[PDB]
Structure 1
């Protein structure tokens, strides 16, 4: 059980994924949204997608 600990197999590799999201349900410890316009912009985007146009 040492070769598996010393080498890696060609083609058997890991990639990296990134994305943007919103986290809700905080107890008043979220963004101020006055210094972060993108939070409100993306919340409005989500609401518009769901059918609400602010």
Structure 2
């Protein structure tokens, strides 16, 4: 009610994740691959 709005509990935390991916299905609004080599490489 209130205490949960003022504090956190030790050991209960969030972490961060990151990754690389490809997105397909665009209407010709993707990369100009002649200047982004990693796109074609991947």
In terms of fraction of residues, the more helix-rich structure is 1
- Which gives a bigger RCO, structure 1 or 2 (Cα 8 Å, sep 6+)? 2
For 1:5 and 1:30, the matched residues in 2 are separated by 43
Tell me the matched-pair count: 42
Q: Which runs of 5+ in 1 are unaligned?
A: 43-54
Deviation at residue 20 of structure 1 after TM alignment: 0.1
- Give the TM-score of the pair, scaled to structure 2: 0.97
